[PDB]
Amino acid sequence: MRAGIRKALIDNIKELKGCYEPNVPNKDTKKPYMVVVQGQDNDHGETIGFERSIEVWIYEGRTTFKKLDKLTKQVVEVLDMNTIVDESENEAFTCIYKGTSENDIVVEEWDAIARGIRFSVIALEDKEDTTNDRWVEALSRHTKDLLEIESYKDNWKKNFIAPCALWRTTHIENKRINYHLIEITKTMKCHVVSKNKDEIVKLLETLETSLIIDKRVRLREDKNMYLTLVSVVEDRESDMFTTGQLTAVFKMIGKIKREGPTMDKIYGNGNL
Amino acid sequence: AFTCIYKGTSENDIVVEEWDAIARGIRFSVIALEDKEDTTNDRWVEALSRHTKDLLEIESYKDNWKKNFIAPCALWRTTHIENKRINYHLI
Amino acid sequence: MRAGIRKALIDNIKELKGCYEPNVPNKDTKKPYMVVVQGQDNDHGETIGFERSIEVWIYEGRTTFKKLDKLTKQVVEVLDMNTIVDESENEAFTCIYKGTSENDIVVEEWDAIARGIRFSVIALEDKEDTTNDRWVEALSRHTKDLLEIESYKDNWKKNFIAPCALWRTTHIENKRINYHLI
Amino acid sequence: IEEASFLNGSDVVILIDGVEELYMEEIKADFEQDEQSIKLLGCQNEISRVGTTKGSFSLNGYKTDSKFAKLGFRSFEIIYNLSNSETLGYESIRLKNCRLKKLPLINSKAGEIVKIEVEGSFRGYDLLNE
Amino acid sequence: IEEASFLNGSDVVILIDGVEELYMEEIKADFEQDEQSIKLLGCQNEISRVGTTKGSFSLNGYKTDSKFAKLGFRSFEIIYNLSNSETLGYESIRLKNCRLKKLPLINSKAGEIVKIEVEGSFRGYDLLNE
Amino acid sequence: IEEASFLNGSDVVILIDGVEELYMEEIKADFEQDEQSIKLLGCQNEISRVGTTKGSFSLNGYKTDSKFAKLGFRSFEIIYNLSNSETLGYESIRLKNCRLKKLPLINSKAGEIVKIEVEGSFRGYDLLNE
Amino acid sequence: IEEASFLNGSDVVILIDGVEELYMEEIKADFEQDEQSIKLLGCQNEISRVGTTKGSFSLNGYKTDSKFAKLGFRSFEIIYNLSNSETLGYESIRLKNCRLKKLPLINSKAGEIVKIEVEGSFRGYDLLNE
């Protein structure tokens, strides 16, 4: 994954002289050069899975910090949410801009000025993008058809292509409302990730309107089943990745499939 | 452009003897670095920001703060949205 | 548990030259090698019991960090929720992948690059897998019969075989609804 | 666990006097009967009879116009299409000679939406579809 | 999704006897009929007719003066302008010969605002606008 | 935004039989009249008339003495001063010949304050002020 | 603490007119009797007798079809099987000659599931099994 970030930075930034591993460069390396330090991997719940931290430490020749500001903006533009393909490992990923190092440090012995940009990567372990939750599959298919963006089903995948949507299930309730009938209620929350926030607003608006108007969703292309909406709510303040904006509650009624024997043959006899 | 916001002051008033000087650190901040648009697809936010601007003769910044906000101003974000189909024809 | 983890890592990973205890290897050791540091045991409630922390520090010859990334993926695959049998103690366990050390460190004096993978083990003190809660026993039996996976009743056991399912009881209420009925 | 379905109440389409009504929120209609309980002279079990039928109906909704106030007590038809979406077997009912019991001229609280309530009686019905 | 509009109930403007009323917060008015159910031999369903009409109304609001207690049981008109804002089609109704059923002389609780409640009967109505 | 005012019900001063009553919590009083609805022989809307009036009242408050139980069913007057303080126009009403409908000897729950409730009827009223 | 078993109400199987009914939520049925209180001429305590009986029943459930509207006021049987899973001793009751008191043609609120309510009367019952 180091190779992907290094290759992207070298290809897209031309002021850059080289991008190295942590303790590679010597004192005669030509500045500006960048260093790709890989941080922790922490478990961040079911929706994100394991989140990795990265730092892209920029180094510059101590002329002035304005060049470092320009180069920082260039790096952030290059890596922030743009999918990167790692040829060495033949697996892609998508860095998320998180912030910047504590201060802008000056290192006198090296005669340089440094700043550390702070990225992260989502869902390191997840490598399938599939779900046994039929409801999630149905709603992700519906969102993809309505919206013409990628729709990931159970949890984030590391190479998500923004703009995209996610349709995880957060809560399930089952009830036997009758002898023959059962009722399955799911509170399914949805994310809409995109670089442009107004695009997030537009996508959420049209998704809400589509869910409200067509109040139910075909569970399968075979039909024979449907998902009736109950309430769709958006909390725009909520986090784009961890929580998700749109919350929708769906329910579906099923009947027990009793297929017992049959009274094919009937006979009776008489007395007095 | 941008607009610095006063936030406080460094931990103590320090005296650096070797430099023969007294130093203090004032602490500012800048808001919404990445925002560059001042626009919103939320028609409601646009409507209320326009209404506030017309009523009040101050700026209005719609969905989120912008780094070069000119005080005094008034932002009009939307925090929570609920949709209901109250009828066969109405929402 | 050091012997079990070391044996598993040596058997399953072939690029490994050796797996040592913390301050064993000298500067003549052939890299890459691994080090099994054993952390705290902390009480984490009734369901987990005592949880032990383990770190498997990988070391590599400072060629490039991509080798260390590959080796870390190999270790995580080998140890993550795969039941391990410690022949020395004759007691099994199941390491749970938990994360990775703070940064990828370079150690110049040793001329190596190191990374610390972080595991843990659950319910160290639990050694029975039995329950006097008849309800839990009944539901664990029902789950096992329906589902064809293990069921562990009152609390986790250290050598749990994934996939599985616990059936602990979290809350009990008793009422005398009548003179004769409870 | 084969499929079933509930007829969600937001599928109704109420046509009052041949023009579709958009703002109705609730509709009720029943076909009463006087039982005419008969106690025979020898049998201990009471016996019922059909007697005479008597329709009654009610409506609630939001006030959009003075349709009902201007309608007066004139006879008018109500058609009610309860569509099912899982399967397309809409249930359609027609009410004949409906007559408002009272004109809801004014009903309006200060801080709330102005809802209209209607109730009356209908002479008969036609189960158009099912 | 073309526009729609609900008539908010705070657009009411009640004119009691030619002077505008500011403190009313709820107004009701209906035009009851007598059903006059009739059985016919050889016709199982009952039949209804208009009968004689009978108005009734009610009002609630905050007490600002003794207008109603001074009014007594005199006949007085009520006008009800329910304006609409999305489109300017106010619905105006006039009630003819309203007469209080009871004078609310005193209705007061220690901790609350002193509210006035009124109800009576009106001989007829004129639907001025819609 | 020009001033308005609500008459808070804690401004009430009730004088029962010439001696001020200071433990009351609420007071109600209405002047009912029998409607005497008449259905004319040719006209299709009912007509009402004033009929005969009949006062009724009611009070609740905290028990502080045996004033009411000792009062019996004697006739007694009630004054009611609802002072307004934003503007000093107090509304004063007198009730003539009030008579308790039922003498509330005992009404007391174990864990609560002993409140007294009264209801009755008054022949007429005098609107002393407004 | 030997075992005991309530009867869960989701074990009910209702056969309306020989075809099983799946969507019923609750069923009620009682067998009234006119008390016929007799005050003897010398004895102080009242005496009551069996009098004449009369069945009544009620149903609620989700609307899945127009079975009841089709059924009209016809006579029809209801059989009700309440199984006890913990002992297998199902209590079965049959109602004879049930007759709807009113056809629930329409009963539907906008935002909710369309439920059907039925009530009527039955001449007699047979306790098929217990």
> Residue B66's closest CA among B15, B18, B13, B3?
B3
DSSP conformation class of D6:
-
Residue type, F46: E
| Cβ under 8 Å to E: F residues 48-107 | 48, 50, 57, 80, 82, 91, 93, 95
Asked whether at least 3 C-beta pairs link C and F within 8 Å, the reply is no
Element (H, E) at C117: strand C112-121
Report chain F's terminal Cα–Cα distance, integer Å.
26
> Residue C168's closest CA among C150, C149, C153?
C153
- Chain B residues in contact with A236 (beta carbon < 8 A): 77-81
Instruction: Return d(Cα C17, Cα G75) in angstroms, integer.
Output: 89
Instruction: Return d(Cα C17, Cα C34) in angstroms, integer.
Output: 8
Q: How many helices (DSSP H) and strands (DSSP E) are in chain C? A: 4, 10
> Residue D27's closest CA among D101, D118, D129?
D118
DSSP conformation class of B43:
H
Instruction: Return d(Cα E115, Cα G58) in angstroms, integer.
Output: 43
Q: Are C40 and C53 in contact (CB under 8 A)?
A: yes
Here the tokens at position C94 are: 């199941």
DSSP conformation class of G17:
T
Instruction: Return d(Cα E53, Cα D102) in angstroms, integer.
Output: 9
Q: Are A165 and A193 in contact (CB under 8 A)?
A: yes
Task: Find tokens 């109420």 and name the residue.
Answer: D14
Here the tokens at position D29 are: 């209609």
Q: Are A117 and A98 in contact (CB under 8 A)?
A: no
Instruction: Return d(Cα B60, Cα A26) in angstroms, integer.
Output: 52
Q: Are C167 and C153 in contact (CB under 8 A)?
A: yes
CB atoms G111 and B88 under 8 Å = no
Contacts 24+ apart (CB under 8 A), E88-91: E89/E130, E90/E129, E91/D63, E91/D65, E91/D66, E91/E7, E91/E129, E91/E130
Q: Are D122 and D97 in contact (CB under 8 A)?
A: yes
Question: How far is residue F78 from each of residues E70, F54, F100, measured CA to CA in Å?
Answer: 19, 16, 12
Alpha carbon dihedral B15, B17, B19, B23, in 10-degree steps, equals: 0
Query: Within 13 Å of residue A1, how many CA atoms lie on the same side as its CB?
Result: 27
Instruction: Return d(Cα A233, Cα A190) in angstroms, integer.
Output: 10
Instruction: Return d(Cα A10, Cα A17) in angstroms, integer.
Output: 8
Question: How far is residue F106 from each of residues B60, F16, F72, F115, G97, measured CA to CA in Å?
Answer: 67, 20, 14, 10, 55
Instruction: Return d(Cα G6, Cα G9) in angstroms, integer.
Output: 9
Largest CA distance in chain B: 80
Element (H, E) at A145: helix A134-147
Q: Which of A226, A256, A257 has its CB closest to that of D86?
A: A226
Instruction: Return d(Cα A151, Cα A141) in angstroms, integer.
Output: 7
Substitution target from D7, D10, D22 for chain B, most B beta carbons within 10 A: D10
Instruction: Return d(Cα D38, Cα D58) in angstroms, integer.
Output: 31
Q: Between vectors from CA E124 to CA E122 and to CA E128, what angle results, nearest 5°? A: 115
Instruction: Return d(Cα F119, Cα F56) in angstroms, integer.
Output: 8
Instruction: Return d(Cα G14, Cα A179) in angstroms, integer.
Output: 10
| DSSP bridge partners of D20 | D15
CB atoms B86 and D13 under 8 Å = no
Q: Are E109 and F9 in contact (CB under 8 A)?
A: yes
Residue of A nearest to G27 (CA): A178
Instruction: Return d(Cα A44, Cα C98) in angstroms, integer.
Output: 10
Q: Which of E99, E104, E123 has its CB closest to that of F30?
A: E104
The verdict on A3 touching C (C-beta cutoff 8 Å) is: yes
The verdict on D5 touching G (C-beta cutoff 8 Å) is: yes
Instruction: Return d(Cα G120, Cα D92) in angstroms, integer.
Output: 24
Q: Are E80 and E27 in contact (CB under 8 A)?
A: yes
Residue type, F6: F
Solved using: cryo-EM
| DSSP bridge partners of A267 | none
